[PDB]
Scaffold this motif. Structure first.
Motif, PDB file in Angstrom:
ATOM      1  N   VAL A 164     -18.948  89.219 112.132  1.00 20.31           N
ATOM      2  CA  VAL A 164     -18.004  89.775 111.168  1.00 20.31           C
ATOM      3  C   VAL A 164     -18.699  90.727 110.200  1.00 20.31           C
ATOM      4  CG1 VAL A 164     -16.182  89.198 109.530  1.00 20.31           C
ATOM      5  CG2 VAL A 164     -16.712  87.639 111.414  1.00 20.31           C
ATOM      6  N   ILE A 165     -19.972  90.487 109.894  1.00 21.47           N
ATOM      7  CA  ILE A 165     -20.695  91.361 108.980  1.00 21.47           C
ATOM      8  C   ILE A 165     -21.314  92.558 109.702  1.00 21.47           C
ATOM      9  CG2 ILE A 165     -22.547  91.446 107.271  1.00 21.47           C
ATOM     10  CD1 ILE A 165     -22.089  88.529 106.706  1.00 21.47           C
ATOM     11  N   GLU A 166     -21.747  92.379 110.952  1.00 22.04           N
ATOM     12  CA  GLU A 166     -22.393  93.460 111.688  1.00 22.04           C
ATOM     13  C   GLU A 166     -21.441  94.604 112.013  1.00 22.04           C
ATOM     14  OE1 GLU A 166     -24.146  91.718 115.130  1.00 22.04           O
ATOM     15  OE2 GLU A 166     -25.416  90.342 113.983  1.00 22.04           O
ATOM     16  N   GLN A 167     -20.135  94.350 112.054  1.00 21.05           N
ATOM     17  CA  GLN A 167     -19.166  95.393 112.370  1.00 21.05           C
ATOM     18  C   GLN A 167     -18.908  96.342 111.206  1.00 21.05           C
ATOM     19  OE1 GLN A 167     -15.509  93.410 113.424  1.00 21.05           O
ATOM     20  NE2 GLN A 167     -15.463  92.209 111.528  1.00 21.05           N
ATOM     21  N   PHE A 168     -19.568  96.138 110.060  1.00 20.64           N
ATOM     22  CA  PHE A 168     -19.438  97.016 108.910  1.00 20.64           C
ATOM     23  C   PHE A 168     -20.704  97.841 108.722  1.00 20.64           C
ATOM     24  CE2 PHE A 168     -15.472  95.681 107.012  1.00 20.64           C
ATOM     25  CZ  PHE A 168     -15.286  94.410 107.516  1.00 20.64           C
ATOM     26  N   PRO A 169     -20.576  99.125 108.389  1.00 17.27           N
ATOM     27  CA  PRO A 169     -21.770  99.957 108.187  1.00 17.27           C
ATOM     28  C   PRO A 169     -22.582  99.474 106.994  1.00 17.27           C
ATOM     29  CG  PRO A 169     -19.790 101.119 107.489  1.00 17.27           C
ATOM     30  CD  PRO A 169     -19.329  99.886 108.204  1.00 17.27           C
ATOM     31  N   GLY A 170     -23.864  99.209 107.238  1.00 18.12           N
ATOM     32  CA  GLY A 170     -24.748  98.677 106.225  1.00 18.12           C
ATOM     33  C   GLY A 170     -24.881  97.171 106.221  1.00 18.12           C
ATOM     34  N   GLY A 171     -24.025  96.459 106.949  1.00 17.55           N
ATOM     35  CA  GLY A 171     -24.108  95.014 107.027  1.00 17.55           C
ATOM     36  C   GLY A 171     -23.846  94.324 105.706  1.00 17.55           C
ATOM     37  N   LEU A 172     -24.897  93.750 105.113  1.00 17.93           N
ATOM     38  CA  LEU A 172     -24.744  93.022 103.860  1.00 17.93           C
ATOM     39  C   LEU A 172     -24.464  93.940 102.678  1.00 17.93           C
ATOM     40  CD1 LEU A 172     -27.575  90.319 104.113  1.00 17.93           C
ATOM     41  CD2 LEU A 172     -25.158  90.116 104.738  1.00 17.93           C
ATOM     42  N   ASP A 173     -24.758  95.233 102.798  1.00 14.29           N
ATOM     43  CA  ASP A 173     -24.568  96.170 101.700  1.00 14.29           C
ATOM     44  C   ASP A 173     -23.161  96.748 101.643  1.00 14.29           C
ATOM     45  OD1 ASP A 173     -27.645  96.346 102.516  1.00 14.29           O
ATOM     46  OD2 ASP A 173     -27.489  96.934 100.406  1.00 14.29           O
ATOM     47  N   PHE A 174     -22.280  96.357 102.560  1.00 16.08           N
ATOM     48  CA  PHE A 174     -20.894  96.806 102.511  1.00 16.08           C
ATOM     49  C   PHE A 174     -20.200  96.178 101.309  1.00 16.08           C
ATOM     50  CE2 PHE A 174     -16.482  97.275 103.756  1.00 16.08           C
ATOM     51  CZ  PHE A 174     -16.469  98.508 104.378  1.00 16.08           C
ATOM     52  N   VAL A 175     -19.686  97.016 100.416  1.00 15.35           N
ATOM     53  CA  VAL A 175     -19.064  96.538  99.187  1.00 15.35           C
ATOM     54  C   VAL A 175     -17.644  96.080  99.487  1.00 15.35           C
ATOM     55  CG1 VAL A 175     -18.300  97.177  96.882  1.00 15.35           C
ATOM     56  CG2 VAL A 175     -20.509  97.982  97.727  1.00 15.35           C
ATOM     57  N   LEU A 176     -17.312  94.867  99.049  1.00 17.66           N
ATOM     58  CA  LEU A 176     -15.974  94.310  99.218  1.00 17.66           C
ATOM     59  C   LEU A 176     -15.159  94.623  97.967  1.00 17.66           C
ATOM     60  CD1 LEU A 176     -17.000  90.882 100.787  1.00 17.66           C
ATOM     61  CD2 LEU A 176     -16.115  92.891 101.977  1.00 17.66           C
ATOM     62  N   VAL A 177     -14.124  95.446  98.125  1.00 21.02           N
ATOM     63  CA  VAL A 177     -13.241  95.821  97.030  1.00 21.02           C
ATOM     64  C   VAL A 177     -11.829  95.352  97.362  1.00 21.02           C
ATOM     65  CG1 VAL A 177     -14.672  97.801  96.422  1.00 21.02           C
ATOM     66  CG2 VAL A 177     -12.701  98.101  97.937  1.00 21.02           C
ATOM     67  N   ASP A 178     -10.964  95.388  96.349  1.00 22.28           N
ATOM     68  CA  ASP A 178      -9.575  94.943  96.463  1.00 22.28           C
ATOM     69  C   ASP A 178      -9.514  93.507  96.988  1.00 22.28           C
ATOM     70  OD1 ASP A 178      -6.843  94.935  96.324  1.00 22.28           O
ATOM     71  OD2 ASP A 178      -6.523  96.261  98.044  1.00 22.28           O
ATOM     72  N   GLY A 179     -10.198  92.620  96.273  1.00 15.55           N
ATOM     73  CA  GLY A 179     -10.356  91.264  96.761  1.00 15.55           C
ATOM     74  C   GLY A 179     -11.254  91.296  97.983  1.00 15.55           C
ATOM     75  N   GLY A 180     -10.751  90.784  99.096  1.00  9.36           N
ATOM     76  CA  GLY A 180     -11.442  90.895 100.365  1.00  9.36           C
ATOM     77  C   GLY A 180     -10.479  91.259 101.474  1.00  9.36           C
ATOM     78  N   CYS A 181      -9.624  92.255 101.216  1.00  7.43           N
ATOM     79  CA  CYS A 181      -8.540  92.583 102.136  1.00  7.43           C
ATOM     80  C   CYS A 181      -9.045  92.997 103.512  1.00  7.43           C
ATOM     81  CB  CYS A 181      -7.663  93.691 101.542  1.00  7.43           C
ATOM     82  SG  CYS A 181      -8.498  95.276 101.292  1.00  7.43           S
ATOM     83  N   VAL A 182     -10.273  93.513 103.611  1.00  6.23           N
ATOM     84  CA  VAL A 182     -10.837  93.845 104.915  1.00  6.23           C
ATOM     85  C   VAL A 182     -11.226  92.612 105.715  1.00  6.23           C
ATOM     86  CG1 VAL A 182     -11.687  96.046 104.041  1.00  6.23           C
ATOM     87  CG2 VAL A 182     -13.182  94.040 104.021  1.00  6.23           C
ATOM     88  N   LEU A 183     -11.278  91.445 105.079  1.00  6.78           N
ATOM     89  CA  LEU A 183     -11.685  90.206 105.724  1.00  6.78           C
ATOM     90  C   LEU A 183     -10.479  89.305 105.951  1.00  6.78           C
ATOM     91  CD1 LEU A 183     -14.952  89.313 103.770  1.00  6.78           C
ATOM     92  CD2 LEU A 183     -14.744  90.482 105.971  1.00  6.78           C
ATOM     93  N   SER A 184     -10.480  88.610 107.086  1.00  8.83           N
ATOM     94  CA  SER A 184      -9.422  87.669 107.412  1.00  8.83           C
ATOM     95  C   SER A 184      -9.431  86.492 106.437  1.00  8.83           C
ATOM     96  CB  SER A 184      -9.579  87.167 108.847  1.00  8.83           C
ATOM     97  OG  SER A 184      -8.710  86.079 109.109  1.00  8.83           O
ATOM     98  N   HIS A 185      -8.335  85.731 106.447  1.00  7.21           N
ATOM     99  CA  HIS A 185      -8.258  84.546 105.598  1.00  7.21           C
ATOM    100  C   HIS A 185      -9.246  83.479 106.051  1.00  7.21           C
ATOM    101  CE1 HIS A 185      -6.541  81.669 102.816  1.00  7.21           C
ATOM    102  NE2 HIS A 185      -6.362  80.814 103.807  1.00  7.21           N
ATOM    103  N   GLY A 186      -9.459  83.356 107.362  1.00  8.35           N
ATOM    104  CA  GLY A 186     -10.427  82.389 107.855  1.00  8.35           C
ATOM    105  C   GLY A 186     -11.859  82.801 107.572  1.00  8.35           C
ATOM    106  N   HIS A 187     -12.140  84.105 107.631  1.00  8.78           N
ATOM    107  CA  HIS A 187     -13.483  84.581 107.314  1.00  8.78           C
ATOM    108  C   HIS A 187     -13.799  84.422 105.833  1.00  8.78           C
ATOM    109  CE1 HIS A 187     -13.056  87.252 111.112  1.00  8.78           C
ATOM    110  NE2 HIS A 187     -13.706  86.141 111.410  1.00  8.78           N
ATOM    111  N   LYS A 188     -12.789  84.538 104.965  1.00  7.25           N
ATOM    112  CA  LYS A 188     -13.011  84.292 103.543  1.00  7.25           C
ATOM    113  C   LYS A 188     -13.471  82.859 103.301  1.00  7.25           C
ATOM    114  CE  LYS A 188      -9.744  87.674 101.588  1.00  7.25           C
ATOM    115  NZ  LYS A 188      -9.359  88.285 102.893  1.00  7.25           N
ATOM    116  N   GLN A 189     -12.921  81.905 104.057  1.00  2.71           N
ATOM    117  CA  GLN A 189     -13.344  80.517 103.917  1.00  2.71           C
ATOM    118  C   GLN A 189     -14.732  80.291 104.499  1.00  2.71           C
ATOM    119  OE1 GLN A 189     -10.035  78.650 105.861  1.00  2.71           O
ATOM    120  NE2 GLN A 189      -8.940  78.273 103.938  1.00  2.71           N
TER     121      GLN A 189
END
Ligand code: ATP
Ligand code: MG
Length: 229
Positions: free
Chosen positions: A126-151
């Motif tokens: 789930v993190i590798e699919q974003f450019p930069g991996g851990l450095d991808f900034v999560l804005v607007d809550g975590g709308c880019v992430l599923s509800h299960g991934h948030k948990q």
């Protein structure tokens, strides 16, 4: 020499209510838990299973004393008390920052120590699919992430904060089975020697627990074995 150290929990005359002067959902609740013990909290609907977890987190009007590893909740900050707990499920609050800060808010681990915990909770793909991996900034809550991934992030966040008491509110029905499987795998690796309070409405969903607690009326009765529960 750290806190929380083992997850020993001691509850004495705990009374919880949702408003000032309201109805006492639980009245004079008292029990004790050994470090790293798998505790099953059994109770029918409306008995107060979720209320007891909210009372642990000081999210209600609570009177009485709770202490963890000898430290009373009247003896530390409110934020430092809740940090000892891992709460699943919950409305996951995603920080307005990178994956790293959301996983390691206190910046106490390296990216190698973070990626290994992220791999255990199943957040590697789930993190590798974003450019930069851990450095991808999560804005607007975590709308880019599923509800299960948030948990899973909330689960991984709890491991990196070294929580010793894990609270599970009906995970057999209120979590996706994939999410419950990943948590049960964490309970044998990172959370191997941590206290787990399993809240369910049926005994069949808490067989692997060493101790049991039953919410009969407004009381809590204790059982050290599944024999005649
Ligand atoms: N915001 C709330 N305000 C006042 N009372 C509440 C609130 N939430 C739950 N309760 C009351 O507290 C009692 C138990 O609540 P609780 O939700 O913790 O039980 P439960 O075991 O979690 O049941 P279930 O999960 O099936 O809804 C209930 O009688 C309920 O009426
Ligand atoms: Mg509930």
């Amino acid at each position: 020499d750290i806190w929380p150290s083992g997850g020993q929990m001691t509850v004495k005359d705990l009374t919880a209510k949702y408003t000032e002067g309201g109805n006492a959902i639980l009245e004079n609740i008292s029990f004790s838990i050994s470090p790293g013990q798998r505790v099953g909290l059994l109770g029918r609907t409306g008995s107060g299973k979720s209320t007891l977890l909210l009372a642990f987190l000081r999210l209600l009007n609570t009177e009485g004393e709770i202490q963890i590893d000898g430290v009373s909740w009247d003896s530390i900050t409110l934020e430092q008390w809740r940090k000892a707990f891992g709460v699943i499920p919950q409305d996951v609050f995603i920080f307005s920052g990178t994956f790293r800060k959301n996983l390691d808010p206190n910046e106490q681990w390296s990216d190698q120590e973070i990626w290994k915990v992220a791999d255990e909770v199943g957040l590697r793909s789930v993190i590798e699919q974003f450019p930069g991996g851990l450095d991808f900034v999560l804005v607007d809550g975590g709308c880019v992430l599923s509800h299960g991934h948030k948990q899973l992030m909330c689960l991984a966040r709890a491991v990196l904060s070294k929580a010793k008491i894990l609270l599970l509110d009906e995970p057999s029905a209120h979590l996706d089975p994939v999410t419950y499987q990943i948590i049960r795998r964490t309970l044998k690796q990172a959370f191997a020697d941590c206290t787990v309070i399993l809240c369910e409405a049926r005994i069949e969903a808490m067989l692997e627990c060493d101790q049991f607690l039953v919410i009969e009326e407004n009381k809590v009765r204790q059982y050290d074995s599944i024999q005649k529960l």
